[PDB]
Structure 1
C-alpha cells in the first residue's frame, strides 16, 4: 500500500447543506501511485468518496 507522510487538511469551502456541501483537499507526500481507503473517524462529517 503506498505509504503516506505529511498529511494535512485544508477545507476549501464548507457549507453544511443536506447534501455534500464541503470540499477538503489533502496535501500529502507519497512514495508511489495507486488507490487506498479514506474515512472520517469522527461522525460530524460524512465523506462522499
Structure 2
C-alpha cells in the first residue's frame, strides 16, 4: 500500500458497527489486505478487504 488517507465520513458510538471509514489508496497491485486495528479503540467488521 502507498498514499492512503483515512476519513471518518460517519461515526456513531453505538453497540453495533456504527462507523464508516473511507481510505484513499494508491496500491502497487490488486490483492487482499488484512485490515486491522492493533489498538482497542475500534473493532472492525471486516478482517480482510
Structure of higher CA gyration radius: 1
User: What is the root-mean-square deviation of aligned Cα atoms in Å?
Assistant: 0.8
| Pairing 1:37–2:31 present | no
Match of residue 17 from structure 1 = 14
CA distance in 2, matches of 1:9, 1:29: 13
More strand by share: 1
Indicate the structure whose relative CO is greater, using CA pairs within 8 Å and at least 6 residues apart. 1
TM-score (norm 2): 0.84
Where has structure 1 moved over 6 Å in runs of 4 or more?
Answer: none
> Any unmatched runs of 5+ in structure 2?
none
